[PDB]
Amino acid sequence: PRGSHMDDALRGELASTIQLEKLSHPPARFDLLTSFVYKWQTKAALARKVSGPMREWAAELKYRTGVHIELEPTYPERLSENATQWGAYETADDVDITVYLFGSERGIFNCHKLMEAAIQQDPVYVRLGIFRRLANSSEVEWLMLRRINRELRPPDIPPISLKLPGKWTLLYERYKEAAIRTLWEETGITVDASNVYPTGHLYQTVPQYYWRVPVRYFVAEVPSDIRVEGPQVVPLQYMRNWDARLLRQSPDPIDRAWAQLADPATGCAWMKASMIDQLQKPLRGDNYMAIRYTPPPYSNLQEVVGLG
Ligand SMILES: Nc1nc2c(ncn2[C@@H]2O[C@H](COP(=O)(O)OP(=O)(O)O)[C@@H](O)[C@H]2O)c(=O)[nH]1
């Protein structure tokens, strides 16, 4: 019942081999979905590529074929263990996951080959660090957004995410291609692929959070004078039309900094790296921007951005 609701929410933002096993009927726990049902016994290293933290790719597979993807840890009691067929999993990739498919065999056949191609790639989150240089200052300003995540979310996703632009790679989409397209979807800024530079990737997960995906990072300079329109895809899902008087007095530092630098008409804000890491210091430690958005030397840009 929760899996469907999350797939319905992503509909607005949508525009070596797999051994399936047909099941006579589904287990009683999955009858409400029941329409055939096929099972795929795999690991989280593979099942993560057809689901996603917010069911990004499980919803696209439904948008494509009409099949419903349902995932469950095969032996979830092992995820409650600290220290073999039983005990704590070594890594998240090793977590046994059982995937269920619901729909017509026509739609299941289409999704099956889509899934066999999905598990071949590396689907990740992308963040294109958009920055501009200030004539009066020496440091750069980065464009920040605050997305209001939905109620149906995994426990590792906050209610509001202070983020730089960027979403996720669609099925068969590539890193830079996703970073540029998702940049416009969240900001409305058009950046050329020759000015986008990869700055690194991060993957930190635990077995209990088997769904977590790597994050590929990019940076690109924007002209200091530019019309930042804000989110054009699902704009209601971002912090907008807020009230600067009362939020300025919120006990959250993010919130106060948002009331002072954010524009409620666009939901966007320009922040310096020293300000972003100060905001991320109590949650992430030091060097939040430097760890993620340090340009490669061939960009001839780590001099300009200031992290280096
Ligand atoms: N949000 C999110 N973060 C992840 C996921 N998987 C890994 N991470 C970690 O997120 C850290 C950096 O996150 P950040 O750049 O602040 O993006 P954000 O956490 O999604 O706002 C990295 O150390 C990654 O290991 C995921 O599926 N979702």
Residue numbers in the entry: 331 to 345, 406 to 424, 426 to 474, 486 to 710
Structure paper excerpt:
Crystals of the MERS1-GTP complex were obtained first and the structure was solved by multiple-wavelength anomalous diffraction (MAD) using a selenomethionine-substituted crystal. The structure was refined to final Rwork/Rfree values of 22.9%/25.7% to 2.45 Å resolution. Density for the nucleotide was evident in the MERS1–GTP structure, wedged into a pocket at the interface between the MERS1 domains. The GTP γ phosphate electron density is weak hence, we constructed the nucleotide as GDP. There are extensive interactions between MERS1 residues and the GDP in this binding site that effectively lock it in place. Lys235 from the Nudix motif makes electrostatic interactions with the GDP phosphate groups. A number of other MERS1 residues contact the GDP phosphate moieties including Arg199, Arg356, and Arg364 as well as tyrosine residues, Tyr289, Tyr360, and Tyr365. In addition, the side chain of Arg284 makes cation-π interactions with the guanine base. Interestingly, clear electron density in the MERS1-GTP structure was observed for an extra helix docked between the two domains of MERS1, next to the Nudix motif. Our discovery of the fortuitously bound helix in the MERS1–GTP structure, which inserts an acidic residue close to the Nudix motif, could explain how MERS2 binding activates MERS1 activity if this residue can substitute for the missing acidic residue in the MERS1 Nudix motif and possibly contributes to magnesium binding, for example.
